[PDB]
């Protein structure tokens, strides 16, 4: 389908995407804290030796600078692939992302843009990351017209989505689930390929209930589908949203019109979490089809704890119990 493949874990798939990008786009540069030696999660190993120190380079320790700098590179038309070392530390750059990058094209009447910017950052829980190594910030960005926010579930998906981000003519934030960096490998095409943005993927067809998640949480809901089938005889339609904004409303609504029930899950806290936008929209478009209230199984409304992580996360038992209750509503 996509040419020769080789087994890659998620960090290797990211390196492969970045390498392919630098190979085919002479303007492209990669920068951020500690990227030169290969990065703290090994995503840029080999790239500086291969492409040159002017193309893969360290910045000072200053996130608002990293993003402002990236925007400036992109304003000249060159591809700028910025790294933020943990998504938790993206906040110093929030003003440069929200007030500047997202509004750049609009506010200039398209005289200037920063479409060739992509910001990549490790994301999501990791077992012991606590408050500042664990966060899932996608909802904060979802309320900002003009940026795209993309989150893959596997190495194959990461490389295809990241290449699309890098090539997309809009500033993109690409969140890499860090707990998957060295998890299981899968076959990933060595040559470049794209997976479309703003397109959900139905990974398992089902007829009784729709389950929606993204990132690592997709694997959780896959398992929940299995539990529900075995324990309840319930057939679940499992959907990976992939792009947070602009999101694939049609694929989700079509699934819910068929099933009449929807459960959305994410690691991020419940309140103001992106599940609230999906739920409210599905309710508007699928109202007459809803057999049961749309359920949201999310992180609690607290900071992300160290020792209590096993109790904090919306795990397969939390999702399963919510599903059981919904099937019985």
């Amino acid at each position: 389908e996509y040419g020769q493949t080789q087994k890659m874990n998620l960090f290797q798939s990211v390196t492969s995407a970045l390498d392919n990008s630098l190979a085919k786009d002479p303007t492209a540069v990669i920068f951020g804290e500690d990227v030169a030696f290969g990065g703290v999660f090994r995503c840029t190993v080999g790239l500086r030796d291969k492409y040159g120190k002017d193309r893969v380079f360290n910045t000072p320790l200053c996130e608002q600078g990293i993003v402002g700098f990236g925007i400036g590179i992109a304003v000249t038309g060159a591809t700028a692939i910025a790294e933020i070392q943990f998504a938790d530390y993206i906040f110093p750059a929030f003003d440069q992302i929200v007030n500047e990058a997202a509004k750049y094209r609009y506010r200039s009447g398209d005289l200037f843009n920063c479409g060739s910017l992509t910001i990549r950052s490790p994301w999501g829980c990791v077992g012991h990351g606590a408050l500042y190594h664990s966060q899932s910030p996608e909802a904060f960005f979802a309320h900002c017209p003009g940026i795209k926010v993309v989150i893959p579930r596997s190495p194959f998906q990461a490389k295809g989505l990241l290449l699309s981000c890098i090539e997309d003519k809009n500033p993109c934030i690409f969140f890499e689930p860090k707990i998957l960096y060295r998890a299981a490998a899968e076959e990933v095409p060595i040559e470049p390929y794209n997976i479309p943005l703003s397109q959900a993927e139905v990974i398992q067809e089902g007829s009784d209930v729709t389950l929606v998640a993204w990132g690592t949480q997709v694997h959780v809901i896959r398992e929940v589908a299995s539990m529900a089938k075995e324990k309840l005889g319930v057939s679940c339609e499992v959907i990976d949203l992939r792009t947070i904004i602009p999101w694939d409303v049609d694929t989700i609504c079509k699934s819910v019109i068929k099933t009449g029930r929807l459960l959305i899950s994410h690691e991020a806290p419940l309140t103001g979490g992106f599940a609230s936008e999906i739920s409210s929209t599905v309710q508007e478009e699928c109202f007459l089809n809803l057999e049961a209230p749309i359920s949201r199984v999310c992180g609690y409304d607290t900071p992300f704890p160290h020792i209590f992580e096993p109790f904090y996360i919306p795990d397969k038992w939390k999702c399963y119990d919510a599903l059981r209750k919904m099937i019985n509503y």
């Binding site: 402002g68 400036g72 304003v75 500047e100 009447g109």
Partner: protein
């Protein structure tokens, strides 16, 4: 000592390093208040045509300011920022740049566009948000931008342009085509975190950029005594490894000389330069006028005729700008992303449906259709 962080000797006595603020970095000047050249070896001896262009750009800017400031007082436009006192820093530095050098700025930089022959019609179109505005009426007045004249669109959040200008300078370096970037900001904006970001990145990443700080002693109501306690902004440059100078912002020749030399060395050496120009919140126009007279290059009759003609040109542009319609309201939806997401198009259709039914309640009279 053997520390990688710094190159230095030991000292065996405890001594704190004291700032020298009372006698700070001196202020470079080329001509006195009477328009006389103080030191002949520093005279750039610009030719008469270019010096007249500096003078006419400044005065035309001042004429436009007077008229648009009044327009704002009457609520004909919603907002205005004048250039009073900043005509010489902007015209003088613009004159020292190559026409394709990229400019980032904020609210005091219209003179750069004026020197670059930005049409009066387009300054007005932006302030009125009319159909001629390439910004499609989306930003507040004086938020100018011109892709053809390499002047990156202004944004209201202070200092955000500073690390961006550094990024554009890095990209220029890579592209290898002998271009500088200049980045203007006030002494207030220099307090933002983004200023520390841009100064530091420009030095460590070796970027061909001129940082041009205008220090007029005030940020809205805040005097510089409440803004910083070192010797202005120029004294900050050396701590970042940036070559730095302070100049008399009322002296177009001192601004020109400093910007010309900063541009030459920034592009040749790939290193940042910081110019801090001192202004008032003894005017640059008066001073240059005195200079022109000494050369026999201007006189009262020319001054009168130009005052007349510049008023006429600005009023012609003003009247045309007020009479143009505003852009189609559909334009509120485009350029949010390059393409329009389906969900955004849905919202645009929802507005079109709404106006079909409730249009009498909207000022459709004024908008293109």
């Amino acid at each position: 000592p053997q520390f990688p962080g710094a190159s230095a000797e030991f000292i065996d006595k405890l001594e704190f390093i004291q700032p020298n603020v009372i006698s700070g970095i001196p202020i470079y000047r080329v001509m006195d208040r009477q328009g006389q050249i103080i030191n002949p070896s520093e005279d750039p001896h610009l030719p008469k045509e270019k010096v007249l262009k500096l003078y006419k750009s400044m005065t035309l800017l001042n004429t436009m300011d007077r008229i648009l400031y009044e327009s704002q007082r009457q609520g004909r436009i919603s907002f205005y920022m004048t250039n009073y006192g900043e005509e010489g820093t902007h015209v003088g530095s613009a004159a020292a740049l190559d026409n394709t050098d990229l400019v980032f700025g904020q609210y005091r930089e219209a003179g750069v566009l004026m020197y670059r022959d930005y049409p009066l019609e387009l300054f007005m179109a932006q302030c009125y948000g009319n159909i001629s505005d390439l910004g499609k009426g989306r930003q507040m007045p004086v938020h100018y931008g011109c892709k053809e004249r390499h002047f990156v669109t202004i944004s209201s959040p202070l200092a955000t342009q500073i690390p961006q200008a550094v990024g554009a300078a890095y990209a220029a370096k890579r592209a290898n085509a002998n271009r500088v970037v200049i980045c203007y900001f006030g002494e207030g904006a220099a307090s933002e975190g983004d200023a520390h970001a841009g100064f530091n990145f420009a030095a460590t990443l070796e970027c061909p950029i001129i940082f041009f700080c205008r220090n007029n002693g005030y940020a809205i109501s805040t005097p510089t005594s409440e803004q910083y306690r070192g010797d202005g902004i120029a004294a900050r440059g050396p701590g970042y490894g940036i070559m730095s100078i302070r100049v008399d912002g009322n002296d177009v020749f001192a601004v020109y000389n400093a910007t010309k030399e900063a541009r030459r060395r920034a592009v040749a050496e790939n290193q940042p330069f910081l110019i801090e120009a001192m202004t008032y919140r003894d005017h640059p126009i008066s001073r240059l006028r005195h200079y022109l007279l000494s050369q026999g290059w201007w006189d009262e009759e020319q001054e009168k005729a130009w005052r007349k003609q510049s008023r006429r040109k600005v009023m012609e542009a003003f009247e045309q700008a007020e009479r143009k319609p505003k852009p189609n309201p559909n334009l509120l939806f485009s350029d949010v992303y390059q393409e329009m997401p389906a969900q955004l198009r849905k919202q645009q259709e929802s507005l079109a449906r709404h106006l079909q039914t409730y249009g009498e309640h909207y000022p459709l009279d004024h908008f293109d259709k």
